[PDB]
């Protein structure tokens, strides 16, 4: 058996000094089965490849153990050196159609049965027969979400300054005209104290002044009403940045340097993209950025190197569940199941299909899904910086008025 290292399905960890792995337990205190794993020590090329014994465990190991219990099997697991599913490639003497990776290893006779996440495809089925899928999951889009904290901090004039200057000019002219009217018939600062008390409610304070007071009281509230209306509108209208709304996203239909997204290597998604009637620019946009593994791809996505990634929906959902910093958008498309890679002359077709269907109908699949894929689930500046600035300004004004009154009292009473 050859198995591909898949993080949500096949966990691979180094063995201990004795050559075995630890006996861990789940939340229910059950012994987790582990099988000795054989594979290369380093996946990257140009390295001292050593076939050290690993210890791979996960989702498919339970199904493999169930199959070995139902029918007599002596299975040994293996890891593909290149870490790829395997499709048709081109080499020297390009007039050759040969399969590489896991599919090529299976065709070469090295392996007889494959228990690994492999998407069923027409090209793969034209040469290797598959069995009934374990579960039906399509492919989706994975994009790292941002955390909106603040925008347009309101300290003294976040919107405009000419409006504030006009308001200041208006209050100054209304104050001086009120003083002139009072003098013609509040000579001291009592008039301006009353005006400021009317502007800002603090409980401090013939017919000529009545109309001025009435119009000033009416005019005072519209400014704050407009300010709070604008604040509410700007809080309601946020960034709402959406990366991908679906397969038919017009933004995805065009290549952009700002948003880079691609798959890892050749797979069923690659064949689906190849067999497109009018989606041609996708290959030119994606062939310039390729990786070697899904772990590296998701690490790059986390490190903001990439913006979106395409893979099986179940893998993305599990990654989002285990890491709340990532979210999955879009909808299911090109939905297809999994399969088992077996040679056409293998007499184990029915003997495996019946067991798979029995396990599916007896609730083993849902139990494994619950116990392996559903472990767990999931202003900074605007109201802080402006508050700090206001507090500093208030402290400065308090000190200034303190020294001002200290000098003024001495000057008045010398």
């Amino acid at each position: 058996i050859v198995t591909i290292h898949q993080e949500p399905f096949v966990y691979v960890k180094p063995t201990l000094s004795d050559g075995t792995c630890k006996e861990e337990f789940t939340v229910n205190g059950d012994p987790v089965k582990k099988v000795i794993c054989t594979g290369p020590n380093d996946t990257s090329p140009g390295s001292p490849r050593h076939t050290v014994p690993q210890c791979c465990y996960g989702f498919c190991i339970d199904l493999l153990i169930k199959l070995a219990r139902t029918m007599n099997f002596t299975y040994e697991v293996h890891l593909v050196a290149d870490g790829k599913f395997g499709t048709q490639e081109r080499v020297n003497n390009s007039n050759k159609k040969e399969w590489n990776g896991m599919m090529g290893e299976l065709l070469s006779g090295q392996a007889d049965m494959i228990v690994a996440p492999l998407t069923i495809n027409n090209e793969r089925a034209q040469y290797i027969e598959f069995s009934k899928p374990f579960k039906y999951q399509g492919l989706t889009i994975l994009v790292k979400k941002e955390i909106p904290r603040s925008t347009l901090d309101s300290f003294m004039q976040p919107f405009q300054s000419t409006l504030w200057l006009l308001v200041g000019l208006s209050v100054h002219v209304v104050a001086v005209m009120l003083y002139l009217l009072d003098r013609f018939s509040l000579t001291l600062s009592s008039a301006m104290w009353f005006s400021w008390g009317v502007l800002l409610n603090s409980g401090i304070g013939s017919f000529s002044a009545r109309i001025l007071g009435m119009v000033w009281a009416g005019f005072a509230m519209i400014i704050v009403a407009s300010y709070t209306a604008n604040l509410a509108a700007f809080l309601v209208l946020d960034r709402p940045e959406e990366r991908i709304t679906g397969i038919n996203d017009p933004r995805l239909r065009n290549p952009s340097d700002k948003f880079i997204y691609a798959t890892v290597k050749q797979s069923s998604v690659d064949i689906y993209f190849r067999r497109q009637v009018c989606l041609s620019t996708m290959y030119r946009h994606m062939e310039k950025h390729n990786y070697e593994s899904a772990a590296e791809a998701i690490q790059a996505v986390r490190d903001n190197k990439l913006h979106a990634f395409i893979w099986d929906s179940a893998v993305l959902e599990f990654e989002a569940s285990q890491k709340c910093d990532l979210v999955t958008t879009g909808e299911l498309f090109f939905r297809s199941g999994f399969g088992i890679g077996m040679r056409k002359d293998s007499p184990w077709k029915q003997n495996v299909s019946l067991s798979i269907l029995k396990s599916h109908e007896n609730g083993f699949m849902e139990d494994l899904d619950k116990t392996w894929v559903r472990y767990q689930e999931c202003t900074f500046e605007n109201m802080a910086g402006v508050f700090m600035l206001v507090a500093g300004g208030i402290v400065a004004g308090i000190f200034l008025i303190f020294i001002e009154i200290a000098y003024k009292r001495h000057k008045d009473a010398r």
Partner: peptide, 25 residues
């Protein structure tokens, strides 16, 4: 925004008229 100038200027005429009325009376 732009309408704020119109709004503030709308009441200025009424305030000036009231001031003239109370000055002449």
């Amino acid at each position: 925004d732009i309408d704020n100038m119109a709004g503030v200027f709308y009441m200025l005429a009424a305030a000036m008229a009231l001031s003239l009325i109370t000055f002449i009376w």
